[PDB]
């Protein structure tokens, strides 16, 4: 039995024609206090997988260490560690999914929601979700926390089903992700303006973007809003 | 609860 | 306080014919009022002509299917590649479920296939391992909507022969695979209309002596 | 399980135990014998939580019988009661205690004296001229205080016991379906079939 | 814990520790079991190099396992107490779970199973004891007589002897005991048991113990005078 | 001394090889498999005439569809039978079906090598496990203390094994009836036994799909013995 | 001599005699042959019988859909080791959704056998194994020895008179390695290889045992009338 | 469901001139129901006396335990245990059950055979020693006993006078407590004689 | 649930309903509540479905192991006690079982043992167990005599379940009948309450409370 | 491994004897003789101290005779250290029995349990047996006065008079000669001392080389008293019988 202390909010992601995109802000909240501002919640594993984690940050740092150790262990007695026997997104996910469920079954969960985004060796997009309960699911768009309520609706207007994935380019997909991050900044009280974004493409590989900012924000209309009903001044 |  | 259970919604349906059996289930996965996936299969081919679904809390459902699939694998190793009969699978699943009697798998399990006489078989389980063979069973969120419709249409309950003064019952008979799929599709469209956790897509697994065939149908996405 | 009584007289111990076994709003049985013979001259009646009562009584019976075989010798009622008390005294601080109250009626062959012991589930032992467990005592103790004499015969004891059962049948809320009466004396244990 | 495999196979296929446990039995005082038509009698030798004994308190050779079953033995005395204790516990445990006393076969099968377990368990040596187990099954009037030995094998006998000079008394019983017509009465059965011990014992004074078991938990041990009467009667008939 | 689980220079476990010598000293047990059933027969070999031979239990039921005969240190077989019976019933509980004869034999053989420095020594007994199942039909297995089991059409174990096995080699064919097999076990037992064969010092049994595993009465075997003697004198 | 009482003792020349005696048990065992191309890997095993009334001892065991082995020596030890492999293959699938690499399979067997050669009380495994499999890096063949030494090979053979088959494969190396996309021809080469280890006896229908795994072929064993094709 | 006040009862101990007194009531009940009027709460191991109030099962259990321990003490030491030593033994034994205690209020009383000094002591349920020159009280009417002892007691009382003071303290305290009474016993202890008296008191 | 079994001149009658409920949801109308342990032993099931079904099939395995080991069919007393000693080990864990072990042996004769999950084990001639036990008792007791015929006894057991099936909301579906004799148990069919009620109402003239 | 250095204490000889028990008995045969004699109105325990030194503190010494409870005592023959281990166990067992049943332990029960412990060391554990033989002298209300002996094998037997330790062969012959059933305690005291005086390996039997004890009903009315004799009391009883 836990309670989360230092937390990270929404992780959002989607598939596009050649790969996957994933994003998450750089905030580490301490309840209502916006305590830490330099927190990286996207963690790459190899050159073909990015694990995005929300929820308790101490448990996130534990998971980082596990993934870091997994890369080391895979390299042992493995001449093809950087080739055929390299870590796949599906291997990394299933490992985490096993751990999450084992921990919930021992009534001592890792208080997280995790999205494993990556590209398989055969070029297939991988995008799957797992959380503190050991619940897993996959979809063309996946999001945690407020992202589930506000990002998914926006991202699903681009990729509403499987057949929309080949029609969606990396430019369109990234634009939707960046737009979703702005909406979350407007409406999620435990979000920050600064965020990271990662693209795993089957051709161009892993592109990790740091220190992005929400921009092109609409605030001007606020000046006209006066009072809460009758008040004219 | 159960199924009786 | 940490609550180890959750409700992933959805509903499943198993019907047994004379020389076949179907196990259907919607592909929608939810938590609370949010959709997680519009296509997340929960009806699985486990080998030896056994299809299985464990609806309810998806984590416990996946864990159970995963363990049964593994149970089939070891049954082959330990008993000279002997085919696991549907009745033997059912008893095996009871022990899996009851094994966690004091921390249950929160799932309504249904399996389907053929018995050792080549006839259609559906077995249904409660969360803690009580099981029973039936011609007909709906499970999950919309079970209460679908099941009485099945009683009426599959087992011809409350239907009497016209003009016999309610004395002669409508005779029982096996349904064709075509007629069964019609009842499945109508059951799921009706459940989709009146249940918020049911929709998106319908996936049916049909089991005959030839093997396991699949069929998919769209459902309303609201 | 509800009514168990015990009366020690001049030359014997008399145990009366209700026959009713009730679960919910149903009397499942009306001929239940709430007693076990621990040894030829030692009898134990019992009452309390369902399941625990019989499980405890039989466990004690087995242990006393084992002792009898090993030593080819019958333990005294005082020795048996002490053994039973210690078991209950261990039990009360267990993970799940035996919720069983007992009366041990025995005839000591060495002393040529009857002996009645009352032991509750906590392991609280007392030797008495007359005893009861549960709500029975609240009627029978005052009645026996008045009518009991130490030099009574077995027949006088049975009439005194009839007087208790009548009072219980008059003023008790529950129907306990009468009692099985057993007498413990120098000649061993025997049951009164017509009560 | 001490793990050593003490009981092990030798090149010729023998377990010497089990066979040496039989030698301990062969050293032990003679014990004999004879079953009649409606009774079983257990006779036991007591060596007479021990005077100044207190027979009131000295452990008796025949032990009650339950009110209906008895166990005599030959071999190491200390070892026998362990088997008897285990048997007595199992007898009460059987009454507790089955709500019925043990059969003589069941009790024998248990005791033999214990003896066997010590022939292939690490850190332990076999029991230097062979037993004769006799009695009557609950609500049954057919006499039962079984024998066990250190190896763990057990079997039923019409009559049998174990211990020192047991081959001599077995020789006697083999020609004197008729299968078609066993000792019809208690007296006949006791006499044949005493006769068989008199081939080996020495004197019929305080050297012979006799215990008679009858149906429905009817067990009684004979006193010196009662046994001496059989000894006196047999010797007078012998001089012929 | 030396380790219990030690290899000899030839590449064999000393204790396993020595246990096989103990089995050669054991009483003869013969099994014959046919398409109508499997027959199991044993030499009782009472050490003395006072011993009640009907108490000698060297043929044993494991389940309704599986039987077992033994030879060697027969006391060692009790825990093996106990394991076999539990394995058979446990499998029925988990899978609502009869357990395969081979799977049962494999479960028993897994105990065999669970010894060392687990139990202190190998078993000193060989088992003939006979049974029937729907898949492979009537089967006869020979389970040794080495942990190895061979399936056999016919097999003899015990003191007169090599002589009886050579006889079974000639006599066995694939079209044997159950009655022919019963007589063949009696015939070969009578040849290798020390004392003269009769209904009291030899026991027969069989397992059929229909009636399951059955130990024969002394009255039934006595008639088969009489039938056997008449047929040998008839030519 | 004085240094062969247990596995924990070194000889003066630095030898482990109990391990060498375990190795001897393999030499007494019936011959089994392993070989592979780039697409498939094949096991061929000569089964042995007690007599004409007995069955033929099964030499080949399946470990997963993509892996399995053949044995030579103590069969119960092979059962223990093959069961361990089954569990490790199965652990890899359930936890990582990943087919166990044949090379890791060998490393795991090496380390399990090793622990039994350095500790008091235990004993070395008395069996040699030939593990074949098809994983993400193509076809593989391993030779396991109970000393702990595991060796990846193109082809090999273990058991009695295995030198005859091993010499043949050493000559045939350049031929059979290029039998790609042709199962029956790779088996034929294996059956011809094991034939070089035969004396007085020949390959019959219930004597020969063949197994194969490859690119679009799950690990499958052929016995009885299914191997009559290759005689 | 308060273990210390289910059965009821009281013990009181006093010192006098070259003597000690210990007294207890005889009641054993189950809350309102009086069950036994013969239940003595004072025991002795050699010349050392121990009174125990509280939960009756523990009173009996501890008596049996201290008999057990003092018997082994005597065999090994080849002498009877003294009050000062026994007091430490009681304290040790009670604190051994610190987080699952015996629900008792023991009271040691006796005269040291070597020095001849009168000794009394009291304990809480987890073994905290309460030594006192004057008096020790325990049980369901401890408040009443404290009041009676504090007013009635005076130092250096003779055995015959001490008897009257301790008896009157116990009786009048017991009469103001519902769960105490039903008879009483008083031990007067001198260097080498001990007198035991049963008191007449109201039986309600 | 409603289950009964009573002892009489001609052996033992055992009767049960076939309804299974999850709260007010009728989950099944076709549940087997009688377990066939062996040709001479029966067991009835009431309470938690899984607990009863799992532990009584387990009981059957323990009875099979008994007759293998002892070369003799297990007594009804011994069989019931294996079950009662099992549930007693789980006492407080939350098992919910109300069972009746019914059978015939030579030494005992026809015997019925009530065994429940709080460890109670009772030998007796008549028992009714389940949510509708009181309704079954009402009809059974008022019409019970020792000298009932096999025909009348079978009907009374059936009629008692029907009475409970009618009044108790958590009982119904169909009646399953068994008769236990010296030769073993005999199945006397599945009787749907849907048809049985009207058949009984018409022929018997009872159930006047209902609109005919 | 360690197998090389294992003596295997719990095994049989080819003749079916327990090596270590036989050798422990050989050890005990060199120990100072201890005699127990049971009379109708009490029991005598007499024991010879092992070659005493003149500077040994005799009065505050305990080598042979130990008290188990108020009703039971033992005479030791063998390793004293071993005996004390067994004595403390026996003392605890007697108190467990009293605690459980509120009755003093019957003599045989205590003897059996202590003998069962010794048996355990001969059958399992791989440890050496206790090199100790006891003579138990005690009373209970069932059998009255009782004498027992136990040895390293764990086998115990009851006696009217018995010797353990050195020269038991000679000592048992002398006891068998002069013992009779209607004997009194005071007569048994004389027999015990006379027997030691003849079987002793010393030149002359003196008070400083003896331990002595009686268990009489010589207390006031129906109760048993244990008397472990003081040095001066042994000196007096030795003069009173005319040995010195
Ligand atoms: Mg919607
Ligand atoms: Mg009380
Ligand atoms: Mg008062
Ligand atoms: Mg009052």
From Swiss-Prot, chain D:
InterPro entries: Ntn_hydrolases_N, Proteasome_beta2, Proteasome_bsu_CS, Proteasome_sua/b, Proteasome_suB-type. One of its GO terms (biological process) is proteasomal ubiquitin-independent protein catabolic process. Keywords: Acetylation, Cytoplasm, Nucleus, Phosphoprotein, Proteasome. One of its GO terms (molecular function) is endopeptidase activator activity. It is found in: Cytoplasm; Nucleus. Pfam families: Proteasome. Transmembrane segments: none annotated. One of its GO terms (cellular component) is nucleus. The modification N-acetylmethionine is found at residue 1. The modification Phosphoserine is found at residue 76. PROSITE patterns: PROTEASOME_BETA_1 (PS00854), PROTEASOME_BETA_2 (PS51476). Gene3D superfamilies: Glutamine Phosphoribosylpyrophosphate, subunit 1, domain 1. Belongs to the peptidase T1B family. Present with 21800 molecules/cell in log phase SD medium. Non-catalytic component of the proteasome which degrades poly-ubiquitinated proteins in the cytoplasm and in the nucleus. It is essential for the regulated turnover of proteins and for the removal of misfolded proteins. The proteasome is a multicatalytic proteinase complex that is characterized by its ability to cleave peptides with Arg, Phe, Tyr, Leu, and Glu adjacent to the leaving group at neutral or slightly basic pH. It has an ATP-dependent proteolytic activity. This subunit has a chymotrypsin-like activity. This is Proteasome subunit beta type-4. It comes from Saccharomyces cerevisiae (strain ATCC 204508 / S288c). The gene is PRE1.
Curated annotation (Swiss-Prot), chain F:
Keywords: Cytoplasm, Nucleus, Phosphoprotein, Proteasome. The modification Phosphothreonine is found at residue 47. The modification Phosphoserine is found at residue 48. Its main location: cytoplasm. GO terms for cellular component: nucleus; proteasome complex; proteasome core complex, alpha-subunit complex; proteasome storage granule. PROSITE patterns: PROTEASOME_ALPHA_1, PROTEASOME_ALPHA_2. SMART domains: Proteasome_A_N. Gene3D superfamilies: Glutamine Phosphoribosylpyrophosphate, subunit 1, domain 1. GO terms for biological process: proteasomal ubiquitin-independent protein catabolic process; proteasome-mediated ubiquitin-dependent protein catabolic process. SUPFAM superfamilies: N-terminal nucleophile aminohydrolases (Ntn hydrolases). It is found in: Cytoplasm; Nucleus. It holds the Pfam family Proteasome. It comes from the Eukaryota. Present with 17100 molecules/cell in log phase SD medium. The 26S proteasome consists of a 20S proteasome core and two 19S regulatory subunits. The 20S proteasome core is composed of 28 subunits that are arranged in four stacked rings, resulting in a barrel-shaped structure. The two end rings are each formed by seven alpha subunits, and the two central rings are each formed by seven beta subunits. The catalytic chamber with the active sites is on the inside of the barrel. Belongs to the peptidase T1A family. This is Proteasome subunit alpha type-5. It comes from Saccharomyces cerevisiae (strain ATCC 204508 / S288c). The gene is PUP2.
Swiss-Prot record, chain G:
GO terms for biological process: proteasomal ubiquitin-independent protein catabolic process; proteasome-mediated ubiquitin-dependent protein catabolic process. Its main location: cytoplasm. GO terms for cellular component: nucleus; proteasome complex; proteasome core complex, alpha-subunit complex; proteasome storage granule. There is a cross-link at residue 188 (Glycyl lysine isopeptide (Lys-Gly) (interchain with G-Cter in ubiquitin)). Keywords: Cytoplasm, Isopeptide bond, Nucleus, Phosphoprotein, Proteasome, Ubl conjugation. It is found in: Cytoplasm; Nucleus. The modification Phosphoserine is found at residue 11. The keyword Cytoplasm applies. SMART domains: Proteasome_A_N. Present with 7210 molecules/cell in log phase SD medium. The proteasome degrades poly-ubiquitinated proteins in the cytoplasm and in the nucleus. It is essential for the regulated turnover of proteins and for the removal of misfolded proteins. The proteasome is a multicatalytic proteinase complex that is characterized by its ability to cleave peptides with Arg, Phe, Tyr, Leu, and Glu adjacent to the leaving group at neutral or slightly basic pH. It has an ATP-dependent proteolytic activity. Belongs to the peptidase T1A family. PANTHER family: PROTEASOME SUBUNIT ALPHA/BETA. This is Proteasome subunit alpha type-6. It comes from Saccharomyces cerevisiae (strain ATCC 204508 / S288c). The lineage of its organism: Eukaryota, Fungi, Dikarya, Ascomycota, Saccharomycotina. The gene is PRE5.
From Swiss-Prot, chain H:
The modification Phosphoserine is found at residue 30. Its main location: cytoplasm. Signal peptide: none annotated. InterPro entries: Ntn_hydrolases_N (IPR029055), Proteasome_beta_3 (IPR033811), Proteasome_bsu_CS (IPR016050), Proteasome_sua/b (IPR001353), Proteasome_suB-type (IPR023333). SUPFAM superfamilies: N-terminal nucleophile aminohydrolases (Ntn hydrolases) (SSF56235). One of its GO terms (cellular component) is cytosol. GO terms for biological process: proteasomal ubiquitin-independent protein catabolic process; proteasome-mediated ubiquitin-dependent protein catabolic process. It comes from the Eukaryota. One of its GO terms (molecular function) is endopeptidase activator activity. It is found in: Cytoplasm; Nucleus. Non-catalytic component of the proteasome which degrades poly-ubiquitinated proteins in the cytoplasm and in the nucleus. It is essential for the regulated turnover of proteins and for the removal of misfolded proteins. The proteasome is a multicatalytic proteinase complex that is characterized by its ability to cleave peptides with Arg, Phe, Tyr, Leu, and Glu adjacent to the leaving group at neutral or slightly basic pH. It has an ATP-dependent proteolytic activity. This subunit may participate in the trypsin-like activity of the enzyme complex. PANTHER family: METALLOPROTEASE TLDD, PROTEASOME SUBUNIT BETA TYPE-3. Belongs to the peptidase T1B family. This is Proteasome subunit beta type-3. It comes from Saccharomyces cerevisiae (strain ATCC 204508 / S288c). The gene is PUP3.
């Amino acid at each position: 039995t836990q309670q989360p202390i230092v937390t990270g909010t929404s992780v959002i992601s989607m598939k596009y024609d050649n790969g996957v995109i994933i994003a998450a802000d750089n905030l580490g909240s301490y309840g209502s206090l916006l305590r830490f501002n330099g927190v990286e919640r996207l963690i790459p594993v190899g050159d073909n997988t990015v694990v995005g984690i929300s929820g308790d940050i101490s448990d996130m740092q534990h998971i980082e260490r596990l993934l870091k150790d997994l890369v080391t262990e895979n390299a042992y007695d493995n001449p093809l560690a950087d080739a055929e026997e390299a870590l796949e997104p599906s291997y990394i996910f299933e490992y985490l999914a096993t751990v999450m469920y084992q921990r919930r079954s021992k009534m001592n969960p890792l208080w997280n929601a995790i999205i494993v985004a990556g590209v398989q060796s055969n070029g297939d997009q991988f995008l799957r979700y797992v959380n503190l309960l050991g619940v897993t699911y996959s979809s063309p768009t996946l999001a945690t926390g407020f992202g589930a309520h506000m990002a998914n609706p926006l991202l699903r207007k681009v990729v509403d089903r499987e057949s929309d994935i080949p029609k969606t380019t990396v430019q369109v997909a990234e634009e939707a992700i960046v737009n979703a991050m702005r909406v979350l900044y407007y409406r999620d009280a435990r979000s920050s303006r600064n965020f990271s974004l990662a693209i795993i493409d089957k051709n161009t590989g892993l592109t990790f973007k740091k220190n992005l900012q929400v921009e092109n924000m609409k605030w001007d209309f606020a000046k006209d809003i006066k009072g809460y009903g009758t008040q004219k001044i | 609860x159960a199924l009786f | 306080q940490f609550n180890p259970y959750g409700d992933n919604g959805g509903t499943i349906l198993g019907i047994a014919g004379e020389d076949f059996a179907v196990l259907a289930g919607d592909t929608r996965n939810i938590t609370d009022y949010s959709i997680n996936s519009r296509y997340e299969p929960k009806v699985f081919d486990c080998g030896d002509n056994i299809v299985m679904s464990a609806n309810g809390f998806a984590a416990d459902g996946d864990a159970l299917v995963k363990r049964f699939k593994n149970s089939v694998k070891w049954y082959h190793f330990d008993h000279n590649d002997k085919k696991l009969s549907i009745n033997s699978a059912a008893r095996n699943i009871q022990h899996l479920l009851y094994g966690k009697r004091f921390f249950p798998y929160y799932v309504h399990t249904i399996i389907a296939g053929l018995d050792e006489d080549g006839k259609g078989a559906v077995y249904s389980f409660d969360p803690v391992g009580s099981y029973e063979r039936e011609q007909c069973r709906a499970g999950g969120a919309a079970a209460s909507l679908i099941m009485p419709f099945l009683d009426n249409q599959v087992n011809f309950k409350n239907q009497y022969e016209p003009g016999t003064n309610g004395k002669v019952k409508k005779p029982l008979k096996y349904l064709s695979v075509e007629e069964v799929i019609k009842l499945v599709r109508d059951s799921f469209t009706s459940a989709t209309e009146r249940h918020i956790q049911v929709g998106d897509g319908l996936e049916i697994l049909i089991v005959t002596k030839d093997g396991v065939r699949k069929e998919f149908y769209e459902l309303k996405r609201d | 399980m509800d009514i168990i009584l015990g009366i020690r007289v001049q030359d014997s111990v008399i145990l009366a135990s209700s026959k009713a076994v009730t679960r919910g709003i149903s009397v499942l049985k009306d001929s239940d014998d709430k007693t076990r013979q621990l040894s030829p001259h030692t009898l134990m009646s019992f009452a309390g939580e369902a399941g625990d009562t019989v499980q405890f009584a039989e466990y004690i019976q087995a242990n006393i019988q084992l002792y009898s075989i090993r030593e080819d010798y019958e333990l005294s009622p005082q020795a048996v009661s002490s053994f039973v008390r210690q078991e209950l005294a261990k039990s009360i601080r267990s993970r799940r205690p035996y919720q069983v109250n007992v009366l041990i009626g025995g005839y000591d062959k060495k002393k040529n004296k009857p002996e009645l012991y009352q032991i509750d589930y906590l392991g609280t032992k007392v030797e008495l001229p007359y005893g009861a467990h549960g709500y029975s005592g609240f009627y029978t103790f005052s009645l026996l205080d008045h009518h009991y004499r130490p030099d009574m015969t077995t027949e006088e004891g049975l009439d005194l016991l009839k007087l208790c059962v009548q009072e219980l049948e008059k003023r008790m809320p529950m129907d306990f379906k009468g009692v099985i009466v057993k007498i413990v004396d120098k000649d061993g244990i025997r049951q009164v079939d017509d009560f | 814990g001490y793990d050593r495999a003490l009981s092990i196979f030798s090149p010729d296929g023998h377990i010497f520790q089990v066979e040496y446990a039989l030698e301990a039995v062969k050293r032990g005082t003679c014990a004999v079991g004879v079953k009649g038509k409606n009774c079983v009698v257990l006779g036991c030798e007591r060596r007479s190099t021990l005077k100044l004994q207190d027979t009131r308190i000295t452990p008796s050779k025949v032990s009650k396992i339950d009110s209906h079953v008895v166990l005599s033995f030959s071999g190491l005395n200390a070892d026998s107490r362990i088997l008897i204790e285990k048997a007595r516990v199992e007898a009460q445990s059987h009454r507790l779970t089955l709500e019925d006393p043990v059969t003589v076969e069941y009790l024998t099968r248990y005791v033999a199973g214990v003896q066997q377990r010590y022939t292939q368990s690490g850190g332990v040596r076999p029991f230097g004891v062979s037993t004769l187990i006799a009695g009557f099954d609950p609500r049954d009037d057919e006499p039962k007589l079984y024998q066990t030995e250190p190896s763990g094998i057990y079997s039923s006998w019409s009559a049998q002897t174990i211990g020192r000079n047991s081959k001599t008394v077995r020789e006697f019983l083999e020609k004197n005991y008729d299968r078609k017509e066993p000792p019809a009465t208690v007296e006949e059965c006791v006499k044949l048991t005493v006769r068989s011990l008199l081939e080996v014992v020495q004197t019929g004074a305080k050297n012979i113990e006799i215990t008679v078991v009858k149906p429905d938990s009817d067990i009684v041990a004979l006193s010196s005078e009662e046994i001496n009467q059989y000894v006196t009667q047999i010797e007078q008939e012998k001089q012929e | 001394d030396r380790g219990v689980s030690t290899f000899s220079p030839e590449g064999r476990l000393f204790q396993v090889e020595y246990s096989l010598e103990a089995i050669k000293l054991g009483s003869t047990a013969i099994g014959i498999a046919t398409k109508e059933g499997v027959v199991l027969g044993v030499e009782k070999r009472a050490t003395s005439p006072l011993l009640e031979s009907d108490s000698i239990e060297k043929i044993v039921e494991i389940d309704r569809h599986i039987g077992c005969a033994m030879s060697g240190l027969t006391a060692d077989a009790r825990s093996m039978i106990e394991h076999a019976r539990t394995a058979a019933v446990t499998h029925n509980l988990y899978y609502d079906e009869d357990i395969n004869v081979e799977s049962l034999t494999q479960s028993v053989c897994d105990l065999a090598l669970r010894f060392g420095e687990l139990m202190s020594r190998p078993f000193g007994v060989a088992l003939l496990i006979a049974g029937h199942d729907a898949d492979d039909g009537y089967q006869l297995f020979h389970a040794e203390p080495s942990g190895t089991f061979y399936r056999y059409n016919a097999k003899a174990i015990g003191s007169g094994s090599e002589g009886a096995q050579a006889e079974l080699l000639n006599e066995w064919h694939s079209s044997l009836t159950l009655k022919e097999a019963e007589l063949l076990v009696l015939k070969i037992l009578k040849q290798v036994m020390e004392e003269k064969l009769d209904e009291n010092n030899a026991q027969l049994s069989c397992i059929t799909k229909q009636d399951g595993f059955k130990i024969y009465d002394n009255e039934k075997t006595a008639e088969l013995i009489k039938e056997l003697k008449e047929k040998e004198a008839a030519e | 001599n004085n240094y062969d009482g247990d596995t924990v003792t070194f000889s003066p020349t630095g030898r482990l005699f109990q391990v060498e005696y375990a190795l001897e048990a393999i030499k007494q065992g019936s011959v089994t042959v392993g070989l592979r191309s780039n697409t498939h890997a094949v096991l061929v095993a000569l089964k042995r019988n007690a007599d004409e009334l007995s069955s033929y001892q099964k030499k080949i065991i399946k470990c997963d859909e993509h892996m399995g082995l053949s044995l030579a020596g103590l069969a119960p030890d092979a059962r223990v080791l093959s069961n361990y492999l089954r569990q490790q293959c199965n652990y890899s699938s359930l936890v990582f959704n990943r087919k166990l690499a044949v090379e890791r399979a060998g490393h795991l067997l090496c380390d399990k056998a090793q622990k039994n050669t350095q500790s008091y009380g235990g004993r070395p495994y008395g069996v040699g194994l030939l593990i074949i499999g098809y994983d993400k890096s193509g076809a593989h063949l391993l030779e396991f020895q109970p000393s702990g030494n595991v060796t990846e090979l193109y082809g090999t053979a273990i058991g009695a008179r295995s030198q005859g088959a091993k010499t043949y494969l050493e000559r045939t190396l350049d031929t059979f390695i290029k039998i790609d996309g042709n199962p029956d021809e790779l088996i034929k080469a294996g059956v011809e290889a094991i034939s070089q280890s035969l004396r007085d006896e020949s390959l019959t229908v219930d004597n020969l045992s063949i197994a194969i795994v490859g690119k679009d072929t799950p690990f499958t064993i052929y016995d009885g009338e299914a191997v009559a094709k290759y005689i | 469901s308060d273990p210390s006040s289910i059965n009821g009862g009281i013990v009181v101990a006093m010192t006098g001139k070259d003597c000690v007194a210990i007294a207890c009531d005889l009641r054993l009940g189950s809350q309102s129901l009086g069950v036994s009027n013969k239940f003595e709460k004072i025991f002795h191991y050699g010349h050392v006396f121990l009174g125990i109030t509280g939960l009756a099962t523990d009173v009996t259990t501890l008596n049996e335990m201290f008999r057990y321990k003092t018997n082994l003490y005597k065999l090994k030491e080849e002498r009877a245990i003294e009050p000062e030593t026994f007091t430490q033994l009681v304290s040790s034994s009670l604190y051994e059950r610190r987080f699952g205690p015996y629900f008792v209020g023991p009271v040691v009383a006796g005269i040291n055979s070597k020095s001849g000094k009168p000794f009394i002591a009291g304990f809480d349920l987890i073994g905290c020693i309460d030594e006192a020159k004057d008096f020790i009280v325990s049980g369901t009417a401890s408040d009443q006993l404290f009041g009676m002892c504090e007013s009635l007691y005076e130092p250096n009382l003779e055995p015959e006078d001490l008897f009257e003071t301790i008896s009157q303290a116990l009786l009048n305290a017991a009469d103001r407590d519902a769960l105490s009474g039903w008879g009483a016993v008083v031990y007067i202890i001198k260097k080498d004689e001990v007198v035991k008296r049963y008191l007449k008191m109201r039986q309600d | 649930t409603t289950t009964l079994a009573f002892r009489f001149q001609g052996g033992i009658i055992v009767a049960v309903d076939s309804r299974a409920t999850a709260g007010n949801w009728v989950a099944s109308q076709t549940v087997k509540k009688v377990i066939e342990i062996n040709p001479f032993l029966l067991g009835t099931m009431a309470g938690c479905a899984a607990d009863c079904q799992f532990w009584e099939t387990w009981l059957g395995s323990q009875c099979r192991l008994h007759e293998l080991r002892e070369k003799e069919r297990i007594s009804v007393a011994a069989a019931s006690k294996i079950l009662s000693n099992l549930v007693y080990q789980y006492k407080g864990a939350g098992l919910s079982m109300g069972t009746m072990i019914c059978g015939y042996t030579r030494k005992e004769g026809p015997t019925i043992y009530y065994v429940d999950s709080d460890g109670t084990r009772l030998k007796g001639d008549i028992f009714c167990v389940g949510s509708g036990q009181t309704f079954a008792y009402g009809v059974l007791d008022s019409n019970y005599k020792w000298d009932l015929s096999v025909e009348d006894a079978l009907y009374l057991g059936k009629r008692s379940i029907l009475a409970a099936a009618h009044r108790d909301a958590y009982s119904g579906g169909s009646v399953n009948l068994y008769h236990v004799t010296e030769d073993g148990w005999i199945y006397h069919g599945n009787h749907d309450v849907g048809e049985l009620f009207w058949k009984v109402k018409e022929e018997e003239g009872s159930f006047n409370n209902v609109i005919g | 491994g360690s197998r090389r250095y294992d003596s295997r204490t719990t095994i049989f000889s080819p003749e079916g004897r327990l090596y270590q028990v036989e050798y422990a008995l050989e050890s005990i045969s060199h120990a100072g003789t201890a005699i127990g004699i049971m009379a109708s109105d009490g029991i005598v325990l007499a024991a010879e101290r092992k070659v005493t030194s003149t500077l040994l503190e005799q009065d505050t010494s305990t080598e042979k005779l130990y008290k188990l409870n108020d009703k039971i005592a033992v005479a030791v023959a063998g390793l004293t250290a071993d005996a004390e281990i067994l004595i403390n166990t026996a003392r605890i067992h007697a108190q467990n029995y009293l605690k459980t049943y509120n009755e003093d332990i019957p003599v045989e029960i205590l003897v059996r349990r202590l003998s069962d412990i010794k048996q355990g060391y001969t059958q399992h554990g791989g440890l050496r047996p206790f090199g100790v033989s006891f003579i138990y002298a005690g009373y209970d209300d069932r059998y009255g006065y009782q004498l027992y002996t136990s040895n390293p094998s764990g086998n115990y037997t009851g006696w009217k008079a018995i010797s353990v330790g050195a020269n038991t062969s000679a000592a048992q012959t002398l006891l068998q000669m002069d013992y009779k059933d209607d004997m009194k305690v005071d007569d048994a005291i004389e027999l015990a001392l006379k027997t030691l005086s003849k079987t002793t390996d010393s030149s002359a039997l003196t008070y400083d080389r003896l331990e002595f004890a009686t268990i009489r009903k010589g207390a006031n009315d129906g109760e048993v008293y244990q008397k472990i004799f003081k040095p001066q009391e042994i000196k007096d009883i030795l003069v009173k019988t005319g040995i010195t």
